[PDB]
RNA sequence: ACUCUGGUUUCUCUUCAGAUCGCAUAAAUCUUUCGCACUAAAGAUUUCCGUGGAGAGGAACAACUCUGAGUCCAAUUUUUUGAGGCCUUGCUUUGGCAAGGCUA
């Protein structure tokens, strides 16, 4: 009965994820599941050390996701 | 689940062959059990019954927990307890000394 | 589950998982123990009272409910 | 549009250098060669290794079954 | 608060709190054709939101139609606003300001008064009758007033219980209806982003007799509450439109499996609806309880004893439940009005969106400068005091708060049509009760007490001591033209003031009513038809003035046109004997009067785009096309004033010195006209030459306005003048056998049948015809009597056509009380109007010259 | 099961019983599916015509309710100037009943008739061997000719699900009969009712309430009009 | 029988200004656009108070409902029909 | 899924009923209007034919269908855990709290 999180507003958008342990990440959304695990293109890591770390396509478990901010205008 | 059957006793095939079978042992052997539980405590007792959430009824328990002073280990004896089973780290049949 | 339908509109005190206190008029609940409390005042420790309003407390962070006062008129 | 477990299947099809983050453990991440997933995102890694951030002593683990309830983020290299 | 309101499902504190959040408000006009289900749909929404307000078993509660003439005629006459709080499919309650508008085409003006204060439209379509006259006209008027258009295909039970169509063929009927509405919207709008399909949620299916109402999402949610694991929005994306269901792969395919499978709409929606209606009406006693048990409906033993129509209404009230598909449709597809504030200000505000107040009205904020706009005046049933009804577009009206009402003639330089009125009380107007409120924030509709005195039709209420640069909203551009003209006198002349009082009151009640006094002291009411003027006359004799009133015969207003250019170039000097104006009048090009009237051109354009239009569309030189001064009697009227004065012969600055007064005299001349003092139409007035006096106290004003009217009149009369007849477009809905009877009725009344086309999926035909409006008096009575009620006609104004006579023909003798033949009808129509007007017996072409 | 009891006060009937009673009473009923037939021929129309001292052609004729305005006693005002009046068609009696406030000076005690009710397009079923839901040839044909989701999309309908009444037949052997009972005259549109006296049931009241048929002699026509006269005086 | 009353009040809070506290102590006040059965709140025009006291302006926010400690809804919804 | 109401029919009485009390329609009387009153209209009253509801009383057989009430879920998203341990200050109600940094 697990409905998907309502995120076609946020598809192909530049979002900054907040992750669990005070962590942060940035990237383009590419999809989801009903469990809100997000797949991300052009992922820049953006740690608290201050230097920005690009990766690319990553997958983030939805358990660890605190918030999405759409940095791009939806 | 691909086993939606009404006559579900696979959960004690779980308790004879699987990982939780270690405690049906102490349902039947009446053996002393050491439980490392989440607040850095130890619960030694004898589990009378339990099932799949690992919630256990334990009888005649000595519980250990240590305090800082730098750590001295204190004890308290409790008659008999229900223990909610997500509040465990590990469960241990106490070993064969002989 | 009438054990908390017994407590609707009673002014209840909800101790939370961080230790914060929600003294609010218990309006509604569900199977996940999400509470709807109206005119809810938060009590934290140094004492101060912080009025919030209609709090939708998610059930994950609720520890213990207890009555503070009878339901108002 | 990519769904995540399809990209996990593409990761094992690529046998990439998958670095997996941890829930609540921001120091230690784990490199690995991903082989298998399931319904609940448990991951087996062939040459997995612990990387701290203060220590940064990469310890080799072998093929692990990292539980789904512990991972945060599957990046590559 | 403080009033005794009926028992309702919501509570009025929640309605007053949804009033503040203007994201949860839907200003909706329920508009459609006559008897297409709108009032019964509002009845269904009222029965949903009011548990004590229930429809009687054998007779439909209307709950709008609160007038006595509405309850006796059965035709909705005035728009009744209903403010309910309706829950959505997700359970979310939205405030709904619903305008139940009359679907009769004569009362189309009333729909316009609802279309102005609405952000959206639900177009109600009989599923049996399909798209009719007023559904096309309100598609046109709804996409032309920049409104979001949704469709409720009401009366789908007529597909089941009357036509007894197969479910595949009734799907074809509903699909044809949706395709017809899509074709009409693509006709009247260049945009194709407003495609109406039930897959989008734009189309709702309904039966307001039996309280069926579903979109695809709300019917899919019945499956989602019956079977748990299904997500209903993805299902609703598959339910309509040549998508078949494969029950072996459990998947919806575009390719049909089995060569006899049905569409998803027929299988999952229409066949359950047919089986519900067929098990109720056919097999109540035998097999209704087992299918009711299959649907999850249990009815009491008292409830199964009902007759078949109340039992149908009850069974579908329990199956479909609340009308959450209507709320789905109007929430997804009708703006916010926060979102809908900007097209509303761009379309209906005179300053436009780019003003400093147009910006603050696009924000729609309740803590803004007050910019209420009232389009309707609702009389209380004592008749004395009116209440102005409209929407607050910014700010907040307050009861007891003094306020500045601006009438329709208020410009920012003519600030005298304003008046500072104290707002007496504010009501949130549901139909049979009013919720008295202390304030009304922006986006909401409001009945206002105390602002009724300085306004006749349409007001902009602002605040005093601020908003000094506050302009009016545009007056209601109506769908049609009030053409039918009745003279009205009291039986006892001593109670003339009561009648005059009552005349003012019907001028407030009916938005396209024109009450004037002609030069003979004859009081004249203009209306759109005979039902419209019958209700106006009922309200005049019974509601407002309690006196006895003689009516004359209904006559029409004529227009005046020319057919060739003027014989001699006409001239007029002022009483100064300076300032000669020299005009000719020639007929306009074909379709140009339709372009000026339907705002295809504006004088509000710059000279470049206007000249480019007239060059690329009607073969004008850019010499002539850059020389257009004005546009007929109003800013959008069917005449043109051009100056063909060369700058060699005339000083162009000295001509622009008196351009305003020549334009004013031309507009007044085309407003009255020299044949019968009725509007000049389709005439190009070319100023050929203009002597202008040098010093400004010798030109201007009292000299050049009547001189310009005299040269407009003489240029008109020297061109060969013709009268114009209003022609009514008549849509007749007859049976297949009564078509030759409709032809016979129309042949006695100069009516030309345009078409007789079968209503596809109904056993009826539509005969579209063109009757003259002077020949339409008792035409619908002739038709429905001759066909024994089987044929029914609605007639609305279409165009003006030249009367077959010649009005300036003294050779024609007219015996006074005879129906004249066609080839001198214009001579009958000109002089009797001239007698009615009271002017002279005949107009000579030399009456406005200077030689005699 | 079918009546109240021995007092014979309330009846409740099965819809096959009401269908076959409707078929047995077919000769006494006009098979009108509307009251559009009684346009300017209903009670309100006749109350209006009695109030205006006007006679609808198929209808009754009374004494004047008010003393008439003699149109040779009114004295040529500017209002009733016959040189101002454009005559196209004679303004009939029917137009002054149809729109009593437009076409009458002094409409007193006058009744606004019901306007159009929408044309009940009910196709009577000649053949019971025909399906109850059937595209009858009285119905004009629908000449055939969409944001559809792709078939590659993974929307599945779940196993428990199918349409709501898939086991139920679309029509039964008494579905068209019940649909015909929806458009049946009173008392045949009922399935429960209160028992009436045999005095109280006029078997032929809805016969003179129709228009008198074509080709009738003058005495039956005046009989129709005088039956209507005492019907209207009763009501 | 299926969906509870507080999620109905959360759906009733859409369009209004709600202030949601999350698990990491961050308080998000702004216009709740959409909310689901799980408390995933797409909100907009967000004033954010972090744990330190800093206030940021984040114009489009989607909070996962697992991490929500509580939401403070408007008191208008004290008169909402599902709270009766 | 266990228990206590209420029934239905018929006969009669009493009272209310401007509700199509009647999906039917009479008669009398009075007043008014015109004719010049079965062949005529209005208004009002009354009587009849004979209703619905409520209340009450009798007597016939049904007694728990109905209307109600009392009476299968440990794997992300809530209820089968990221939990527990270290450091500085403000006050210590010398138990320790609050904030932040951590470590796992
Ligand atoms: N068969 C059928 N008839 C309906 C349905 N809905 C309404 N009607 C009938 O159709 C007639 C339409 O009347 P209304 O709906 O009240 O009028 P309207 O549609 O608002 O149009 P206006 O008269 O202009 O106000 C009514 O007599 C209803 O009894 C329907 O769903 N099915
Ligand atoms: Mg209506």
mmCIF file of N, CA, C and O in Angstrom, chain E residues 19 114 152 164 171 226 241-242 308 316 366 383 425 517-518 531 636 638 642 711 728 760 788 821:
data_model
loop_
_atom_site.group_PDB
_atom_site.id
_atom_site.type_symbol
_atom_site.label_atom_id
_atom_site.label_comp_id
_atom_site.label_asym_id
_atom_site.label_seq_id
_atom_site.Cartn_x
_atom_site.Cartn_y
_atom_site.Cartn_z
ATOM 1 N N UNK E 19 -12.282 31.218 4.313
ATOM 2 C CA UNK E 19 -12.375 32.488 3.612
ATOM 3 C C UNK E 19 -11.059 33.250 3.641
ATOM 4 O O UNK E 19 -10.721 33.932 2.670
ATOM 5 N N UNK E 114 -21.955 36.333 -13.364
ATOM 6 C CA UNK E 114 -21.293 35.289 -12.628
ATOM 7 C C UNK E 114 -19.926 35.005 -13.199
ATOM 8 O O UNK E 114 -19.031 34.607 -12.456
ATOM 9 N N UNK E 152 -19.036 19.372 -16.698
ATOM 10 C CA UNK E 152 -19.800 18.351 -16.003
ATOM 11 C C UNK E 152 -20.809 17.808 -16.996
ATOM 12 O O UNK E 152 -21.757 18.505 -17.361
ATOM 13 N N UNK E 164 -31.602 4.178 -23.172
ATOM 14 C CA UNK E 164 -31.207 2.786 -22.992
ATOM 15 C C UNK E 164 -30.150 2.389 -24.008
ATOM 16 O O UNK E 164 -30.261 1.382 -24.704
ATOM 17 N N UNK E 171 -20.784 5.391 -24.042
ATOM 18 C CA UNK E 171 -19.422 5.903 -24.012
ATOM 19 C C UNK E 171 -19.122 6.697 -25.270
ATOM 20 O O UNK E 171 -18.452 7.729 -25.212
ATOM 21 N N UNK E 226 -12.719 0.236 -1.932
ATOM 22 C CA UNK E 226 -13.225 -1.130 -1.924
ATOM 23 C C UNK E 226 -12.074 -2.131 -1.889
ATOM 24 O O UNK E 226 -12.036 -3.021 -1.036
ATOM 25 N N UNK E 241 -10.945 6.364 -22.671
ATOM 26 C CA UNK E 241 -10.368 6.718 -23.948
ATOM 27 C C UNK E 241 -9.615 5.686 -24.748
ATOM 28 O O UNK E 241 -8.404 5.831 -24.896
ATOM 29 N N UNK E 242 -10.285 4.627 -25.208
ATOM 30 C CA UNK E 242 -9.729 3.589 -26.083
ATOM 31 C C UNK E 242 -8.645 2.773 -25.403
ATOM 32 O O UNK E 242 -7.819 2.158 -26.078
ATOM 33 N N UNK E 308 -38.853 4.151 -7.091
ATOM 34 C CA UNK E 308 -37.633 3.802 -7.805
ATOM 35 C C UNK E 308 -36.704 4.993 -8.023
ATOM 36 O O UNK E 308 -35.481 4.838 -7.929
ATOM 37 N N UNK E 316 -27.288 5.692 -5.163
ATOM 38 C CA UNK E 316 -26.114 6.374 -5.676
ATOM 39 C C UNK E 316 -25.552 7.401 -4.702
ATOM 40 O O UNK E 316 -24.385 7.771 -4.834
ATOM 41 N N UNK E 366 -5.497 39.894 1.514
ATOM 42 C CA UNK E 366 -6.505 40.510 2.381
ATOM 43 C C UNK E 366 -6.003 41.722 3.134
ATOM 44 O O UNK E 366 -6.814 42.562 3.536
ATOM 45 N N UNK E 383 -38.329 44.292 -1.430
ATOM 46 C CA UNK E 383 -38.157 45.064 -2.639
ATOM 47 C C UNK E 383 -37.438 46.381 -2.471
ATOM 48 O O UNK E 383 -37.013 46.961 -3.475
ATOM 49 N N UNK E 425 -23.903 45.854 6.245
ATOM 50 C CA UNK E 425 -23.654 44.501 6.702
ATOM 51 C C UNK E 425 -23.024 43.722 5.567
ATOM 52 O O UNK E 425 -23.131 44.092 4.399
ATOM 53 N N UNK E 517 -35.995 56.626 -21.211
ATOM 54 C CA UNK E 517 -37.188 57.368 -21.584
ATOM 55 C C UNK E 517 -36.925 57.985 -22.942
ATOM 56 O O UNK E 517 -35.922 58.680 -23.128
ATOM 57 N N UNK E 518 -37.809 57.725 -23.891
ATOM 58 C CA UNK E 518 -37.643 58.311 -25.203
ATOM 59 C C UNK E 518 -38.166 59.744 -25.188
ATOM 60 O O UNK E 518 -38.722 60.214 -24.193
ATOM 61 N N UNK E 531 -39.213 35.690 -22.695
ATOM 62 C CA UNK E 531 -39.188 35.178 -21.330
ATOM 63 C C UNK E 531 -38.475 36.148 -20.407
ATOM 64 O O UNK E 531 -38.937 36.391 -19.287
ATOM 65 N N UNK E 636 -15.997 50.391 -28.924
ATOM 66 C CA UNK E 636 -16.134 49.201 -29.763
ATOM 67 C C UNK E 636 -17.536 49.254 -30.339
ATOM 68 O O UNK E 636 -18.449 48.605 -29.828
ATOM 69 N N UNK E 638 -19.727 49.530 -34.331
ATOM 70 C CA UNK E 638 -19.509 49.056 -35.698
ATOM 71 C C UNK E 638 -19.271 50.139 -36.739
ATOM 72 O O UNK E 638 -19.353 49.834 -37.927
ATOM 73 N N UNK E 642 -12.930 58.174 -40.119
ATOM 74 C CA UNK E 642 -11.652 58.369 -40.783
ATOM 75 C C UNK E 642 -11.589 59.828 -41.207
ATOM 76 O O UNK E 642 -12.622 60.418 -41.526
ATOM 77 N N UNK E 711 -23.196 66.698 -39.609
ATOM 78 C CA UNK E 711 -22.539 66.223 -40.818
ATOM 79 C C UNK E 711 -22.494 64.697 -40.848
ATOM 80 O O UNK E 711 -22.562 64.108 -41.929
ATOM 81 N N UNK E 728 -32.655 36.737 -34.803
ATOM 82 C CA UNK E 728 -32.429 35.730 -33.788
ATOM 83 C C UNK E 728 -31.985 34.428 -34.420
ATOM 84 O O UNK E 728 -32.603 33.949 -35.373
ATOM 85 N N UNK E 760 -26.608 13.460 -32.268
ATOM 86 C CA UNK E 760 -26.039 12.115 -32.386
ATOM 87 C C UNK E 760 -26.112 11.358 -31.081
ATOM 88 O O UNK E 760 -25.510 11.775 -30.094
ATOM 89 N N UNK E 788 -47.303 20.221 -30.345
ATOM 90 C CA UNK E 788 -47.828 19.686 -29.084
ATOM 91 C C UNK E 788 -46.753 19.600 -28.009
ATOM 92 O O UNK E 788 -46.688 18.624 -27.265
ATOM 93 N N UNK E 821 -46.160 43.733 -46.181
ATOM 94 C CA UNK E 821 -45.301 42.796 -46.906
ATOM 95 C C UNK E 821 -43.838 43.174 -46.753
ATOM 96 O O UNK E 821 -43.493 44.262 -46.295
#
